[PDB]
């Protein structure tokens, strides 16, 4: 056999994997996925930082969806502080949690199309992802890595201008998905590339802890919304895709359905935002308006403190799962009660998937393997860390 | 943007495109907008605001201990009720 290192350099490798294969003629035998080419080691870097400082790190792991990561932190921090946010903040966190979900699935769709050489949808839809980055920029001042979701809730109130254009934005989008409906969804070549590839039995999934659509494609119905409507999801209407064959075609159609599903939800979140603070009343966690801090003393005092040593969590080490579109997400805090975490492991949903890939690798030809990475929505940033 | 070209375009489209403008023209929204004023906040009342009630972090308690390292009709019991059967999509039963 012929030993062969692959990426990072391949566009298919996404600049991260080095899964060496000891190929035969072209059928694989050995196929080990090395990792640690991106390992930023943030676990110790989280430890020496005040809990408000930890917040950027999560935009830094899921490159695409962003607000959901920070929400994944605000839930896990508010648990230990036992703090329950004003409702408007949660309607917002769902609203941009779902728009982040649109960005993430558009990402996975069009890139998976690129490895299949489709080219066009990419350019047909990033024209839209700039349309959304215009929005995170309108609410954060940054096109991406917006810090707008916070443990107290949110940095700032929504500008008056959005509420119309966002509707306008989704006034037409369904058609843009129709344009895909007229492609890969029906297209002949596409089925052959993906049909009956990387099928996974329900048990291996339940063993490795597969989650999200990666379960839902092979028929396991496990979900992190309706099982635990941790926010406004309990009020929100939507319905969950489940695959049949475990075909990548299945998982695909699921993601398209979830995109439809956010088309359903975001409608209702636009339909239902209360007036109210988008932040907690407490100045011992949530900082004062610039107007009030510059007259009232105590506001300026606690202002000075949260921005210097910050709120103090009561001591405790805990773990929380998150409904990332990619799967269960890991928030393993270890806090001595000091604003510095003692430790903080972060389970990436894609970690288990990549652990499971080699099971799906062997006995498949290389194009199958290139199909597989796109099967699992894996942004490698979260995975090694 | 000529109308015959619009006809032939929508023709190939199988869809009206004029019905969902793709390129974002005139409507958009105004950049320069009148000031937000913002919500007043629930607990800015002056009559009462003792920290003893609004506080949340104060209620935190270390976990109840059972069995611990130091110090027959039992009826086998679930940790929590077992997961329920879901509905089948209902309004769109199949894709």
């Amino acid at each position: 056999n012929i030993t062969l290192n692959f990426g990072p350099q391949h566009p298919a490798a996404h600049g991260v994997l080095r899964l060496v294969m000891e190929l035969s003629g072209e059928m694989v035998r050995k196929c080990d996925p090395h990792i640690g080419l991106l390992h930023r080691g943030t676990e110790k870097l989280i430890e020496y930082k005040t809990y408000l400082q930890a917040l950027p790190y999560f935009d830094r792991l899921d490159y695409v969806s962003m607000m959901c990561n920070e929400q994944a932190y605000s839930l896990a921090v508010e648990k230990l502080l036992n703090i329950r946010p004003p409702p408007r903040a949660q309607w917002i966190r769902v609203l941009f949690g779902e728009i982040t979900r649109l960005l993430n699935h558009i990402m996975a769709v069009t890139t998976h199309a690129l490895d299949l050489g489709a080219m066009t949808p990419f350019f047909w839809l990033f024209e839209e992802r700039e349309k959304m980055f215009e929005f995170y920029e309108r609410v954060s001042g940054a096109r991406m890595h917006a810090a707008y979701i916070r443990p107290g809730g949110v940095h700032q109130d929504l500008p008056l201008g959005l509420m119309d254009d966002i509707y306008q934005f989704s006034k037409n989008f369904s058609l843009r998905l129709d344009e895909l409906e007229e492609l890969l969804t029906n297209n002949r070549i596409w089925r052959n590339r993906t049909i009956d590839i990387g099928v996974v039995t329900a048990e291996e999934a339940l063993n490795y802890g597969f989650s999200g659509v990666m379960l839902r494609g092979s028929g396991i119905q496990w979900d992190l919304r309706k099982t635990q409507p941790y926010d406004v999801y309990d009020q929100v209407e939507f319905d969950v895709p489940v695959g049949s064959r475990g075909d990548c075609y299945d998982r695909y159609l699921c993601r398209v359905e979830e995109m439809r599903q956010s088309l359903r939800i975001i409608a209702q979140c636009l339909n239902k935002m209360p007036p109210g603070e988008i932040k907690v009343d407490d100045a011992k966690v949530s900082p004062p308006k610039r107007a009030e801090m510059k007259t009232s003393m105590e506001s300026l005092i606690h202002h000075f403190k949260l921005y210097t040593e910050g709120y103090q969590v009561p001591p405790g080490a805990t773990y929380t799962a998150i409904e990332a579109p990619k799967g269960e997400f890991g928030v393993y805090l270890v806090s001595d009660g000091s604003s510095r975490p003692y430790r903080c492991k972060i389970k990436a949903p894609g970690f288990a998937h990549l652990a499971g890939l080699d099971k799906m690798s062997k006995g498949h030809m290389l194009a199958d393997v290139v199909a597989i990475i796109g099967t699992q929505d894996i942004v490698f940033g979260e995975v090694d860390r | 943007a000529t109308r015959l070209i619009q006809r032939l375009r929508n023709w190939a489209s199988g869809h009206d495109l004029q019905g969902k403008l793709q390129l974002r023209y005139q409507e958009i929204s105004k950049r320069t907008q009148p000031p937000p004023k913002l919500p007043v906040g629930p607990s800015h009342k002056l009559s009462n605001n003792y920290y003893c009630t609004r506080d949340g972090r104060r209620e935190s308690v270390p976990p109840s201990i059972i069995m611990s390292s130091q110090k027959t009709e039992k009826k086998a019991v679930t940790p929590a009720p077992p997961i329920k059967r879901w509905e089948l999509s209902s309004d769109q039963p199949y894709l």
């Binding site: 929504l158 509707y167 369904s174 359903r264 636009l270 339909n271 | 007043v40």
Partner: peptide
């Protein structure tokens, strides 16, 4: 003048696809 942006109305949108046979 208290305000912010709660919804102004919001008309119908269709998450449902259409794929005409034409």
């Amino acid at each position: 003048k208290q305000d912010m942006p709660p919804p102004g109305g919001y008309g119908p949108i269709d998450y449902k696809r259409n794929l005409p046979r034409r």
